[PDB]
Design a protein around this ligand. Structure first.
Ligand SMILES: O=S(=O)(CCO)c1ccc(-c2ccc(C3CCCC3)c([C@H]3C[C@H]3c3ccccn3)c2)cc1
Length: 231
């Protein structure tokens, strides 16, 4: 239906195969920040002296569904209500009702050059693998090449592979939001795309990933409160 259908299936299946695994028991992941049910881990990885540090976080959010969380994370029309590190944003291409290509710039992290990013953003429902298992809602944001890439001489091009992966547990009567819990696994593999001082990048990640997870999940709770549930 569009030229990236195969690529999207590969990227989504890779996350379903590899990104949901538990890391509580895994000494290969460093637990860097914990705030209640939010647990943020990383691995320290550098390629040619540039930090790549894979980031993986888990969180458990009361009173929202995975379909709601993924809709709010994917919908560009609400981005400004929760994002705090974006300078500019442009939708470059619409591929399908659930897949777009975006260009964005991030606020500069001194003393490195400002970064920009050009990525496909897709939202998918993955049916339960065995009938005992939960369904999954996933948003995957991953870098792609495009000709309508902006000339932006202030920016170095980063590359990203990010997924927000959600599974929803629920306890003639509707289910209340009191009885719904969204289990999130968030993974971010960011390649800065050129020089940056490692200690600064690592301090920024350790502050900004928890700040994002807290602000974004709180935002979804706030916007859904008192509205009918979208499962
Ligand atoms: O979840 S998303 O898809 C949401 C749509 O935007 C996402 C999140 C984060 C990034 C991103 C892009 C650039 C950087 C670095 C690279 C060198 C200089 C800036 C970082 C590192 C610094 C970390 C960070 C973490 C959270 C928010 C922003 N910054 C992160 C991109 C996309």
């Amino acid at each position: 239906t569009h030229r990236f259908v195969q690529k999207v299936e590969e990227m989504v299946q890779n996350h379903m195969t590899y990104s949901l695994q538990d890391v509580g028991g895994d000494a290969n992941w460093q637990l860097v920040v914990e705030e209640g049910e939010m647990k943020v881990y990383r691995r320290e990885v550098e390629e040619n002296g540039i930090v790549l540090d894979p980031l993986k976080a888990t969180h458990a959010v009361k009173g929202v569904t995975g379909h709601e969380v993924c809709n709010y994370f994917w919908n560009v029309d609400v981005r400004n209500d929760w994002e705090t590190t974006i300078e500019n944003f442009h939708v470059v291409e619409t591929l399908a009702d659930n897949a777009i290509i975006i260009y964005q710039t991030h606020k500069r992290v001194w003393p490195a050059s400002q970064r920009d990013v050009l990525y496909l953003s897709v939202i998918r429902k993955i049916p339960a693998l065995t009938e005992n298992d939960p369904e999954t809602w996933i948003v995957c944001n991953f870098s792609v090449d495009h000709d309508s890439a902006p000339l932006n001489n202030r920016c170095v091009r980063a590359k990203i592979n990010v997924a927000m992966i959600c599974q929803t547990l629920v306890s003639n009567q509707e289910i209340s939001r009191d009885n719904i819990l969204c289990k999130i696994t968030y993974v971010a593999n960011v390649n800065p795309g050129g020089w940056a001082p490692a200690s600064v990048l690592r301090a920024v990640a350790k502050r900004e990933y928890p700040k994002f997870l807290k602000r974004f999940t709180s935002y979804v709770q706030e916007k859904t409160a008192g509205k009918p549930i979208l499962f």
